[PDB]
Amino acid sequence: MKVGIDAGGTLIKIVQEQDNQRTFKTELTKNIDQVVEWLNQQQIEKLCLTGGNAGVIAENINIPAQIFVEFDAASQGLGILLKEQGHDLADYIFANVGTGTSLHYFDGQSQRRVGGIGTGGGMIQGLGYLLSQITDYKQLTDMAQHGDRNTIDLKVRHIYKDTEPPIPGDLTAANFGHVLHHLDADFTPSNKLAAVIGVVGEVVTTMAITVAREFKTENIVYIGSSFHNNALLRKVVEDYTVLRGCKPYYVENGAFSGAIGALYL
């Protein structure tokens, strides 16, 4: 078989292609050892690698392998996944929301990195843990769905009281801006985790909508594993993308865009 692997900061994504039956496999990066041992016992017609931990794999394998830059690979797998799923977009921003976040403009032909920020899945896990002691990703993201952000976040209408503001009053003005206004109140693990995802969702969208306006597209494709088991994040991202007059897109297996692309380059 043919196998493509995007070995990221947190997750290793593997796709095997047989003929036209894909297999999508996720493993932890910390169990990268167990991906190598597994790889060495497969019969592999072609192997392709990308991501930060690609070299760790290449060196520990007894089989040659091509290595591609993850920006190029993500773009290539995303284009394939968008066609398959019936989106024919002339151009778009894509925002890869992984351990960290990378923002790309795809003009129709190629991708170009137009920015990035360290607000993404790693912040959700890291800051999440600092605010809740919860290490289990499932527990963390499940708990955050039940959360309320009202006592934590400060909207524009709170700063502008009775009077009429110069931007929409419902907008978030200050993430964690209301904490000092509602001391006494507990601040529950749910509420705080919702606010973390809230701030991460909002920064990514802001960057994406800004860059979208810069390169003159209304299409914003969001990918990365950060969106798995995290409805709040997609909602946050999606509502605000629409609110700013852009069109958000999520993609089935969009978090495997790198591993697929590695196979088709």
Ligand X SMILES: COCCCCCNC(=O)CCNC(=O)[C@H](O)C(C)(C)COP(=O)(O)O
Q: Which residues contact 163 (CB under 8 A, 6 or more apart)?
A: none
- 165 belongs to the binding site for its own copies (CB under 8 A): yes
Nearest distance from C-beta of residue 205 to Mg ion, angstroms: 19
Tokens 């969702």 identify what position? 201
Token pair belonging to 152: 């934590």
| Separation of alpha carbons 141 and 259, rounded Å | 25
- 67 belongs to the binding site for ligand X (CB under 6 A): no
Nearest distance from C-beta of residue 52 to ligand ADP, angstroms: 7
To the query of whether residue 70 is one of the catalytic residues in this protein, the response is yes
Nearest distance from C-beta of residue 19 to its own copies, angstroms: 31
- 120 belongs to the binding site for Mg ion (CB under 5 A): no
Which of Mg ion, ligand ADP, ligand X, none has residue 156 at its interface (CB below 5 to 8 Å by kind)? ligand X
- 124 belongs to the binding site for ligand ADP (CB under 6 A): yes
Closest C-alpha to 147, from 235, 36, 40: 235
- 9 labeled part of a ligand binding site: yes
Element (H, E) at 167: none
Q: Which residues contact 194 (CB under 8 A, 6 or more apart)?
A: 144, 145, 146, 147, 148, 149, 152, 232
The DSSP code sequence of 233-257 is HHHHHHHHHHHTT-EEE--TTGGGH
- 77 belongs to the binding site for Mg ion (CB under 5 A): no
- 152 labeled part of a ligand binding site: no
Binders of ligand X among residues 119 to 148 (CB under 6 A) are none
Q: Which residues contact 11 (CB under 8 A, 6 or more apart)?
A: 26, 27, 28, 29, 225, 255
Find the farthest-apart pair of alpha carbons in the chain and give their distance in angstroms, rounded.
70
Nearest distance from C-beta of residue 19 to ligand ADP, angstroms: 27
DSSP state of 77: H
Please enumerate, by residue number, every residue annotated as part of a binding site for ATP: 6-13, 99, 121-125, 137, 225
Please enumerate, by residue number, every residue annotated as part of a binding site: 6-13, 99, 121-125, 137, 225
Residues that bind ligand X (CB under 6 A): 8-9, 52, 98-102, 116-118, 156, 159, 170-174, 202, 206, 240
Residues that bind its own copies (CB under 8 A): 8-9, 51-56, 58-59, 67, 69-71, 99-100, 113-123, 125-127, 129-131, 135, 152-154, 156, 158-163, 165-167, 172-180, 183, 187, 192, 199, 202-203, 206-207, 210-211, 213-214
What are the catalytic residues?
A: 70
